Design an enzyme around this catalytic site. Structure first.
Site, PDB file in Angstrom:
ATOM      1  N   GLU A  73     -12.947   5.556 -29.151  1.00  0.00           N
ATOM      2  CA  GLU A  73     -14.059   6.360 -28.642  1.00  0.00           C
ATOM      3  C   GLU A  73     -14.779   7.037 -29.801  1.00  0.00           C
ATOM      4  OE1 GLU A  73     -13.057   8.648 -24.819  1.00  0.00           O
ATOM      5  OE2 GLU A  73     -11.096   8.533 -25.809  1.00  0.00           O
ATOM      6  N   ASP A  98      -7.744   6.960 -29.058  1.00  0.00           N
ATOM      7  CA  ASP A  98      -8.233   7.952 -28.110  1.00  0.00           C
ATOM      8  C   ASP A  98      -8.995   8.988 -28.936  1.00  0.00           C
ATOM      9  OD1 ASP A  98      -7.977   9.033 -25.262  1.00  0.00           O
ATOM     10  OD2 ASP A  98      -7.287  10.771 -26.419  1.00  0.00           O
TER      11      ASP A  98
HETATM   12  O1  LIG Z   1      -2.535  19.893 -18.691  1.00  0.00           O
HETATM   13  C1  LIG Z   1      -3.023  19.153 -19.800  1.00  0.00           C
HETATM   14  C2  LIG Z   1      -4.496  18.829 -19.642  1.00  0.00           C
HETATM   15  O2  LIG Z   1      -4.616  17.924 -18.517  1.00  0.00           O
HETATM   16  C3  LIG Z   1      -5.947  17.485 -18.250  1.00  0.00           C
HETATM   17  O3  LIG Z   1      -6.484  16.743 -19.308  1.00  0.00           O
HETATM   18  C4  LIG Z   1      -6.371  15.314 -19.161  1.00  0.00           C
HETATM   19  C5  LIG Z   1      -7.690  14.750 -18.628  1.00  0.00           C
HETATM   20  O4  LIG Z   1      -7.975  15.309 -17.350  1.00  0.00           O
HETATM   21  C6  LIG Z   1      -7.601  13.224 -18.526  1.00  0.00           C
HETATM   22  O5  LIG Z   1      -8.857  12.704 -18.112  1.00  0.00           O
HETATM   23  C7  LIG Z   1      -7.198  12.614 -19.885  1.00  0.00           C
HETATM   24  O6  LIG Z   1      -8.264  12.717 -20.789  1.00  0.00           O
HETATM   25  C8  LIG Z   1      -8.309  11.737 -21.851  1.00  0.00           C
HETATM   26  C9  LIG Z   1      -9.142  10.524 -21.422  1.00  0.00           C
HETATM   27  O7  LIG Z   1      -8.556   9.884 -20.292  1.00  0.00           O
HETATM   28  C10 LIG Z   1      -9.201   9.549 -22.597  1.00  0.00           C
HETATM   29  O8  LIG Z   1      -9.908   8.372 -22.238  1.00  0.00           O
HETATM   30  C11 LIG Z   1      -9.886  10.247 -23.774  1.00  0.00           C
HETATM   31  O9  LIG Z   1     -11.156  10.664 -23.418  1.00  0.00           O
HETATM   32  O10 LIG Z   1      -9.126  11.398 -24.171  1.00  0.00           O
HETATM   33  C12 LIG Z   1      -8.923  12.378 -23.116  1.00  0.00           C
HETATM   34  C13 LIG Z   1      -7.973  13.408 -23.690  1.00  0.00           C
HETATM   35  O11 LIG Z   1      -6.849  12.770 -24.286  1.00  0.00           O
HETATM   36  O12 LIG Z   1      -5.996  13.225 -20.374  1.00  0.00           O
HETATM   37  C14 LIG Z   1      -6.056  14.666 -20.517  1.00  0.00           C
HETATM   38  C15 LIG Z   1      -4.736  15.123 -21.111  1.00  0.00           C
HETATM   39  O13 LIG Z   1      -3.645  14.807 -20.259  1.00  0.00           O
HETATM   40  C16 LIG Z   1      -6.847  18.687 -17.952  1.00  0.00           C
HETATM   41  O14 LIG Z   1      -8.178  18.246 -17.723  1.00  0.00           O
HETATM   42  C17 LIG Z   1      -6.812  19.660 -19.131  1.00  0.00           C
HETATM   43  O15 LIG Z   1      -7.597  20.803 -18.827  1.00  0.00           O
HETATM   44  C18 LIG Z   1      -5.363  20.076 -19.414  1.00  0.00           C
HETATM   45  O16 LIG Z   1      -5.314  20.912 -20.562  1.00  0.00           O
HETATM   46  O1  LIG Z   2     -11.034  15.264 -23.042  1.00  0.00           O
HETATM   47  C1  LIG Z   2     -10.779  15.679 -21.703  1.00  0.00           C
HETATM   48  C2  LIG Z   2     -11.750  15.029 -20.737  1.00  0.00           C
HETATM   49  O2  LIG Z   2     -11.463  13.612 -20.743  1.00  0.00           O
HETATM   50  C3  LIG Z   2     -12.316  12.831 -19.916  1.00  0.00           C
HETATM   51  O3  LIG Z   2     -13.651  12.905 -20.321  1.00  0.00           O
HETATM   52  C4  LIG Z   2     -14.114  11.790 -21.101  1.00  0.00           C
HETATM   53  C5  LIG Z   2     -15.187  11.038 -20.320  1.00  0.00           C
HETATM   54  O4  LIG Z   2     -14.643  10.554 -19.099  1.00  0.00           O
HETATM   55  C6  LIG Z   2     -15.715   9.876 -21.163  1.00  0.00           C
HETATM   56  O5  LIG Z   2     -16.764   9.216 -20.468  1.00  0.00           O
HETATM   57  C7  LIG Z   2     -16.222  10.393 -22.524  1.00  0.00           C
HETATM   58  O6  LIG Z   2     -17.426  11.092 -22.372  1.00  0.00           O
HETATM   59  C8  LIG Z   2     -18.437  10.751 -23.344  1.00  0.00           C
HETATM   60  C9  LIG Z   2     -19.520   9.903 -22.686  1.00  0.00           C
HETATM   61  O7  LIG Z   2     -18.944   8.704 -22.184  1.00  0.00           O
HETATM   62  C10 LIG Z   2     -20.603   9.568 -23.711  1.00  0.00           C
HETATM   63  O8  LIG Z   2     -21.659   8.863 -23.070  1.00  0.00           O
HETATM   64  C11 LIG Z   2     -21.150  10.851 -24.365  1.00  0.00           C
HETATM   65  O9  LIG Z   2     -21.822  11.614 -23.423  1.00  0.00           O
HETATM   66  O10 LIG Z   2     -20.077  11.644 -24.914  1.00  0.00           O
HETATM   67  C12 LIG Z   2     -19.079  12.013 -23.928  1.00  0.00           C
HETATM   68  C13 LIG Z   2     -18.080  12.922 -24.618  1.00  0.00           C
HETATM   69  O11 LIG Z   2     -18.728  14.043 -25.205  1.00  0.00           O
HETATM   70  O12 LIG Z   2     -15.216  11.169 -23.185  1.00  0.00           O
HETATM   71  C14 LIG Z   2     -14.702  12.284 -22.427  1.00  0.00           C
HETATM   72  C15 LIG Z   2     -13.668  12.971 -23.295  1.00  0.00           C
HETATM   73  O13 LIG Z   2     -13.488  14.320 -22.896  1.00  0.00           O
HETATM   74  C16 LIG Z   2     -12.188  13.289 -18.462  1.00  0.00           C
HETATM   75  O14 LIG Z   2     -13.054  12.524 -17.637  1.00  0.00           O
HETATM   76  C17 LIG Z   2     -12.538  14.774 -18.355  1.00  0.00           C
HETATM   77  O15 LIG Z   2     -12.347  15.218 -17.019  1.00  0.00           O
HETATM   78  C18 LIG Z   2     -11.656  15.589 -19.308  1.00  0.00           C
HETATM   79  O16 LIG Z   2     -12.080  16.943 -19.302  1.00  0.00           O
END
Ligand SMILES: OC[C@H]1O[C@H](O[C@H]2[C@H](O)[C@@H](O)[C@@H](O[C@H]3[C@H](O)[C@@H](O)[C@@H](O)O[C@@H]3CO)O[C@@H]2CO)[C@H](O)[C@@H](O)[C@@H]1O
Ligand SMILES: OC[C@H]1O[C@H](O[C@H]2[C@H](O)[C@@H](O)[C@@H](O[C@H]3[C@H](O)[C@@H](O)[C@@H](O)O[C@@H]3CO)O[C@@H]2CO)[C@H](O)[C@@H](O)[C@@H]1O
Ligand SMILES: OC[C@H]1O[C@H](O[C@H]2[C@H](O)[C@@H](O)[C@@H](O)O[C@@H]2CO)[C@H](O)[C@@H](O)[C@@H]1O
Ligand code: CA
Ligand code: CA
Ligand code: CA
Ligand code: CA
Ligand code: CA
Length: 1052
Positions: A675, A646
């Site tokens: 990622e 992750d």
């Molecule tokens: O309250 C904790 C935290 O919760 C929320 O963050 C979560 C994201 O909304 C959720 O999408 C997920 O994000 C991860 C992606 O799924 C994963 O593929 C990769 O991109 O890493 C991301 C982070 O680990 O999980 C997080 C954490 O639970 C909320 O948006 C935050 O503001 C809040 O602080």
């Molecule tokens: O970390 C918290 C964050 O997690 C999730 O966001 C992820 C996106 O869903 C995921 O697509 C990826 O975004 C990347 C794009 O795919 C890529 O093309 C390029 O633009 O870089 C992006 C990251 O900078 O990773 C993020 C990780 O944050 C979740 O959907 C969010 O709601 C949440 O805040």
């Protein structure tokens, strides 16, 4: 030497002293540092009110909107107020403001008991009361921020030390440095002298290389200074302090203890002849091992033994401690609170836990009692040795609850549990068994390590399948909500949600309104919230108390590999912790070694949250070791075949590669990927990104083909969601009513898609939309070079994942109004075909084969069973089950309402049709080694494309794979070549490129008859091939007595 102390020079005197029955309040205006003209304190007043605790004020102020309580007078040092009193005893309440804004964030209470003269002075946002303007004035010169960095034994980097003749490093063992009653800095210290940052520090911390450096004497007792608080102070020649800041010590901790500490093993290490406990805590003053009984009563507390060279603590006992519960009692200074904290913490290297992770437990993972029958002999069903082996990887990304929470054919007590995978007669297991037989090779599991966001105590949880009365008993927010009336009803939560559907809309999103409350106390969460990195999650076990979950997890792994025939990949989240600080229940690492395991802001010392949560520091040696040691356990003791990192981009490239080197010694065929986006950490170290990992063998998700086929991007909102059509939804060829995409823009997406089907290699050569010869790196992707890999095995293609909208929901946002239901099902298959029939590793979301919908939810991590539902009984795809969470999709309600009901919701007929299409694609992927060449050089020598250039038929993708004499040796004895044709368009297309070659449709598609994606395809006598709208055809050149001419790549 000069005694540094608070500014006693031009210290402001008292403007006036309160008289009989009155109190005066001064507002020391630090701006008096120059004062060359009378400032305006007219729009400045106070908010007075005498109530319970304090009621000395006489005739206070009425409403908060009152701004007449202006200064009684003022001078160069600020204004002052003369407040009338009824009695010179008691206290009063005040709030210094500036019009209506709280100049100070606190209800200051001036007590005549502490300040007899009733004459005090305050400061702009200081939340404190002083007995004089003199004290307040010096209060602005106290310790602030933490922009000082002790990076190694003799180096201190600090901006506020430049020029200042007196630069020192003070320290206090059990106290917080400040200033004695005489306003002086007594505490001992170490004199600092300006120097030039060595090459060693610049290389370790490039982002600090430009900071003013300072040198420490060699005879400095670092170990002792690190036992308490350390503060950097600067003062002029006379000895007057200009600034004092806290110190970040992660750097010197590594320089001093890391090497010695890296050489040891940690955790409760139990053999059958004894146990050795070890925890790294180089700054702790004391550490005791507390042993608890099963009922959690203290059995004993053992002071541990500290190793001076490593900073680690240990304790050795007998084998009788097997199964005991324990915690480490810490006595350590935490910079965030500035005090020597005292608390019990679980083991960061814990390998077993009690319910809800409250206590760690001593365990030997090698014990036969913790292994299912035949565990030691478990073999990996799919090979991962050569690149060709790796390329065959076809991943199904799943979640424990998403799999069985809704399956009534899975025994009730196993729903949402690891063991559900053992119910061979369930709809879900039989479905996965069929997917495996058809070509799905790996199951990737969302967070199954110990997450924190689900309460493991069953009586504190309520799920939608249970009575609403249970929800009200465990969730107070529901009981005080608009849904309180359902509390004493006889309905279950899901029954209530179902009835709310008919009246649900953008103007009344009642389904999500109730679900948002349910999400707080249910059993659902993706789990990207790390509590313990090397223990299985407890809520997925039938019994979360103790070792029970270990055997259940293994039983699941064995079932997947042995009975379902698929390899297993674990989603790991080492880029951040669930929390930090000395008070949060889930803060483990930051409690034991404060400010070391988390990445901090260079100036404030605050834990960064770019990842979402509490950013970790993989660049620090002991955290890097924890990661590698953790991966070793999952690999050896849990037999995991691969890992998906992750936010791998927040990790140094060097750290990921070192970890891989370590693990390859345990399992030589382990596969790493993750990622590799831009983490914005390049200023600190070379990050593990798509670009930097080229040629390393570490894979990365590719966003190129993903966006080109899906259309748009993950950040789109509003009308952009519909405007940005993709190749899979008819960009250019079947425009909707809002899009403005040009034919040129549509063809650019096709360039990206073709490049992706060839492994998204930087050096692959193709003909672009304008007929120009281009290498993959020359095809643009939002301003960056498109192709970035050296081998297709370094690329993971996909068109759907747990993150962002499902493929079906995207097609629903983008499809033209006239594209009927059958056409949309084929768009889903056509989209997936670019991935399944491509050279890059294939990745997909659990349920794409069932047209999975989340009712348009973009980020469903905490949206529970309702929005994440996957129905293996095949009644529907969970589409149109209520508007999604308003907090994140509310801005999309308008566009959702406009496109949602274009066509009917998929039912059993459509789901079966899609599963058929999907299994046809995966079966084709493994039907020949030509689809998964593995080596980049081989892809370049064999793969090419037709229908390219300015005269191309838009939407038609034609890829050839050579097995003829010019390619080299025949890799497939049945064919001299293969043609992949994907007609992503509403017209029938005819191919004349192979007239007189003898092409034939794959036997696999022929066998599917009219259920094939190639149904209606025609191979004419003249060799021409005609494809119907939205179809996919795989054609082959049958091989004769000897290798034939094939389909040679055209020289360009
Ligand atoms: O309250 C904790 C935290 O919760 C929320 O963050 C979560 C994201 O909304 C959720 O999408 C997920 O994000 C991860 C992606 O799924 C994963 O593929 C990769 O991109 O890493 C991301 C982070 O680990 O999980 C997080 C954490 O639970 C909320 O948006 C935050 O503001 C809040 O602080
Ligand atoms: O970390 C918290 C964050 O997690 C999730 O966001 C992820 C996106 O869903 C995921 O697509 C990826 O975004 C990347 C794009 O795919 C890529 O093309 C390029 O633009 O870089 C992006 C990251 O900078 O990773 C993020 C990780 O944050 C979740 O959907 C969010 O709601 C949440 O805040
Ligand atoms: O009613 C007295 C009340 O005063 C203060 O509360 C303020 C608050 O700070 C303002 O933001 C705004 O809401 O007006 C309130 C009073 O009207 C004190 O904080 C509070 O203790 C006290 O009861
Ligand atoms: Ca006073
Ligand atoms: Ca847990
Ligand atoms: Ca939840
Ligand atoms: Ca930064
Ligand atoms: Ca051949």
């Amino acid at each position: 030497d000069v005694v540094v102390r608070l500014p006693d020079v031009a210290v402001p005197g008292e403007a006036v002293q309160a008289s009989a029955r009155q109190a005066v309040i001064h507002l020391v205006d630090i701006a008096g540092i120059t004062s060359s003209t009378p400032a305006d304190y007219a729009t400045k007043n106070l908010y007075l009110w005498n109530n319970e605790t304090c009621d000395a004020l006489s005739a206070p102020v009425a409403d908060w909107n009152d701004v007449s309580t202006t200064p009684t007078g003022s001078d160069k040092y600020g204004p002052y107020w003369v407040i009338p009193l009824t009695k010179e005893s008691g206290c009063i309440n005040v709030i210094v403001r500036d019009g209506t804004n709280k100049l100070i964030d606190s209800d200051l209470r001036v007590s005549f008991s502490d300040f007899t003269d009733r004459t005090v002075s305050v400061i702009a946002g200081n939340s404190a009361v002083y007995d004089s303007r003199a004290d307040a004035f010096r209060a602005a010169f106290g310790v602030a921020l933490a922009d000082a960095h002790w990076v190694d034994k003799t180096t201190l980097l600090w901006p506020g030390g430049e020029n200042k003749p007196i630069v020192r490093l003070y320290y206090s063992h059990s106290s917080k440095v400040a200033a004695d009653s005489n306003g002086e800095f007594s505490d001992k210290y170490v004199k600092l002298t300006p120097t030039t940052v060595n090459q060693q520090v610049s290389m370790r911390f490039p982002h600090l290389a430009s900071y003013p450096a300072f040198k420490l004497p060699d005879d400095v007792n670092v170990d002792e200074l690190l036992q308490g608080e350390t503060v950097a102070i600067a003062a002029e020649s006379d000895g007057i302090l200009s600034s004092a800041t806290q110190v970040q010590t992660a750097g010197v901790l590594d320089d001093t203890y890391a090497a010695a500490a890296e050489a040891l093993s940690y955790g409760a290490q139990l053999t059958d002849s004894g146990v050795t406990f070890r925890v790294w805590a180089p700054t702790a003053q004391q550490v005791e091992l507390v042993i608890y009984s099963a009922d959690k009563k203290v059995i004993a507390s053992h002071p541990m033994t500290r190793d001076s060279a490593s900073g680690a603590w240990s304790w050795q006992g007998g084998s009788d401690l097997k199964g005991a519960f324990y915690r480490y009692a810490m006595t350590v200074y935490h910079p965030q609170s500035r005090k020597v904290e005292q608390y019990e913490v679980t083991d960061p290297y814990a390998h077993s836990l009690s319910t809800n992770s409250e206590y760690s437990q001593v365990v030997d993972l090698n014990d036969s009692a913790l292994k299912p029958e035949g565990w030691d002999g478990l073999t990996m069903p799919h090979a991962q040795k050569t690149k060709a082996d790796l390329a065959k990887m076809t991943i199904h990304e799943s979640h424990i609850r998403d799999l069985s929470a809704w399956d009534q054919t899975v025994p009730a007590e196993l729903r949402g549990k690891y063991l559900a995978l053992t119910a061979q007669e369930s709809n879900m297991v039989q479905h996965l068994k069929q997917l495996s037989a058809s070509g799905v090779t790996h199951i990737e599991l969302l967070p199954v390590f110990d997450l924190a966001t689900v309460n493991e105590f069953s009586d504190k949880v309520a799920d939608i399948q249970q009575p609403f009365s249970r929800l009200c008993e465990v969730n107070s927010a529901v009981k005080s909500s608009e849904f309180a009336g359902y509390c004493d009803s006889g309905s279950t939560v899901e029954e209530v949600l179902t009835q709310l559907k008919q009246n649900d809309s953008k103007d009344n999103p009642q389904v999500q309104a109730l679900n948002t409350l349910v999400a707080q106390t249910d059993s659902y969460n993706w789990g990207y919230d790390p509590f313990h990195y090397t223990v299985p999650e407890g809520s997925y076990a039938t019994d979360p108390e103790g070792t029970a979950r270990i055997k259940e997890f293994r039983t699941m792994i064995q079932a997947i590999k042995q009975d379902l025939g698929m390899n297993v990949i674990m989603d790991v989240v080492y880029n951040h912790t669930n929390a930090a600080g000395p008070t949060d229940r889930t803060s483990v690492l930051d409690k034991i070694v404060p400010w070391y395991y988390q990445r901090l802001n260079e100036t404030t010392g605050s834990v960064e949250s770019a990842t979402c949560c509490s950013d970790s520091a993989p660049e620090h040696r002991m955290f890097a070791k924890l990661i590698a040691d953790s991966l070793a356990v999952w690999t050896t003791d849990y037999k995991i075949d691969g890992f998906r990192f992750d936010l791998m981009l927040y990790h140094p490239k060097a750290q990921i590669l070192s970890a891989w080197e370590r693990i390859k010694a345990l399992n030589p065929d382990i596969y790493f990927f993750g990622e590799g986006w831009d983490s914005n950490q390049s200023d600190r170290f070379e990050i593990a990104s798509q670009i930097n990992l080229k040629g390393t063998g570490i894979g990365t998700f590719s966003d190129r083909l993903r966006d080109a086929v899906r259309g748009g991007g993950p950040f789109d909102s509003g009308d952009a969601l519909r405007q940005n059509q993709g190749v899979g939804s008819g960009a250019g060829v079947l425009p909707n009513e809002l899009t403005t995409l040009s034919d040129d823009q549509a063809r650019h997406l096709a360039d990206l898609t073709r490049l992706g089907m060839a492994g998204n290699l930087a050096d692959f050569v193709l003909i672009d939309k304008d007929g120009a010869v281009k290498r993959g790196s020359e095809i643009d992707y939002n301003g960056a070079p498109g192709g970035y890999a050296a081998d297709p095995t370094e690329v993971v293609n996909y068109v759907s994942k747990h993150d962002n909208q499902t493929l079906w929901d995207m097609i629903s946002y983008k499809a033209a109004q006239e594209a009927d239901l059958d056409t949309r099902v084929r768009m889903q298959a056509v989209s997936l075909a670019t991935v399944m029939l491509g050279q890059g590793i294939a990745f997909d979301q659990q349920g794409s084969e069932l047209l999975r919908s989340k009712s348009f939810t973009r980020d469903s991590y905490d949206s529970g069973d309702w929005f994440n539902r996957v129905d293996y009984s095949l009644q529907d795809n969970n589409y149109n089950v209520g508007m999604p969470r308003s907090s994140d999709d509310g801005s999309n309600y308008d566009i959702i309402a406009r496109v949602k009901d274009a066509v009917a919701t998929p039912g059993e007929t459509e789901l079966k049709q899609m599963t058929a299409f999907y299994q046809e694609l995966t079966a084709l992927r493994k039907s020949s080694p030509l689809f998964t060449l593995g080596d980049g050089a081989t892809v370049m020598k064999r793969v090419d494309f037709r229908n390219t250039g300015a005269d191309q038929q838009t939407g038609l993708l034609v890829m050839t794979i050579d097995d003829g004499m010019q390619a080299g040796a025949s890799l497939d004895s049945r064919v001299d070549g293969i043609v992949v044709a994907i007609n992503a368009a509403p017209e029938s297309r005819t191919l004349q490129d192979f007239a007189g070659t003898s092409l034939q449709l794959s036997a696999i598609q022929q066998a599917a008859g009219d259920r094939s994606l190639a149904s209606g395809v025609q191979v004419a006598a003249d060799g021409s091939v005609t494809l119907p709208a939205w179809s996919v055809a795989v054609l082959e050149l049958p091989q004769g007595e000897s290798q034939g001419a094939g389909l040679p790549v055209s020289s360009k």
